[PDB]
Amino acid sequence: GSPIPHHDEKTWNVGSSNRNKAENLLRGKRDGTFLVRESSKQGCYACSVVVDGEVKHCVINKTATGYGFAEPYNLYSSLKELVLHYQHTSLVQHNDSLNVTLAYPVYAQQRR
Amino acid sequence: YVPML
């Protein structure tokens, strides 16, 4: 019985307008950190995740259909589900230099 | 922007 902090969308949701900022926040966290922000996209998102210590920006969705991490599957109108899947799934299946996952909430919230 | 699976 453990109440994960990911259950909340604010734990990692930084909103929009935080590219070098959300990246400046990741610079220091531990490998596996991740944050979901937005941008001038048409409504897509970008999850700034720390990989091997070097934070990078990735995309979560591309075409209006859901919030997967690269491929459109199932539905769900929220990222909390996507982030939850990759939260335990490796992200190397696409890159052998990734092997990262959303295991650490960029802003976390295990305090108050 | 890195491509994921």
UniProtKB/Swiss-Prot annotation, chain A:
Lineage: Eukaryota, Metazoa, Chordata, Craniata, Vertebrata
Family of the protein in this entry: Belongs to the PI3K p85 subunit family.
Transmembrane segments: none
SH2 domain span: 12-106
Protein name per Swiss-Prot or TrEMBL: Phosphatidylinositol 3-kinase regulatory subunit alpha
Function: Binds to activated (phosphorylated) protein-Tyr kinases, through its SH2 domain, and acts as an adapter, mediating the association of the p110 catalytic unit to the plasma membrane. Necessary for the insulin-stimulated increase in glucose uptake and glycogen synthesis in insulin-sensitive tissues. Plays an important role in signaling in response to FGFR1, FGFR2, FGFR3, FGFR4, KITLG/SCF, KIT, PDGFRA and PDGFRB. Likewise, plays a role in ITGB2 signaling.
Domain notes: The SH3 domain mediates the binding to CBLB, and to HIV-1 Nef.
Species of the source: Homo sapiens (Human)
Tissues showing expression: Isoform 2 is expressed in skeletal muscle and brain, and at lower levels in kidney and cardiac muscle. Isoform 2 and isoform 4 are present in skeletal muscle (at protein level).
Quaternary structure annotation from Swiss-Prot or TrEMBL: Heterodimer of a regulatory subunit PIK3R1 and a p110 catalytic subunit (PIK3CA, PIK3CB or PIK3CD). Interacts (via SH2 domains) with CCDC88A/GIV (tyrosine-phosphorylated form); the interaction enables recruitment of PIK3R1 to the EGFR receptor, enhancing PI3K activity and cell migration. Interacts (via SH2 domain) with CSF1R (tyrosine phosphorylated). Interacts with PIK3R2; the interaction is dissociated in an insulin-dependent manner. (Microbial infection) Interacts with HIV-1 Nef to activate the Nef associated p21-activated kinase (PAK). This interaction depends on the C-terminus of both proteins and leads to increased production of HIV.
Disease / disorder: Agammaglobulinemia 7, autosomal recessive: A primary immunodeficiency characterized by profoundly low or absent serum antibodies and low or absent circulating B-cells due to an early block of B-cell development. Affected individuals develop severe infections in the first years of life. SHORT syndrome: A rare, multisystem disease characterized by short stature, anomalies of the anterior chamber of the eye, characteristic facial features such as triangular facies, lack of facial fat, and hypoplastic nasal alae with overhanging columella, partial lipodystrophy, hernias, hyperextensibility, and delayed dentition. The clinical phenotype can include insulin resistance, nephrocalcinosis, and hearing deficits. Developmental milestones and cognition are normal.
Modifications the protein undergoes after translation, according to the UniProt entry: Polyubiquitinated in T-cells by CBLB; which does not promote proteasomal degradation but impairs association with CD28 and CD3Z upon T-cell activation.
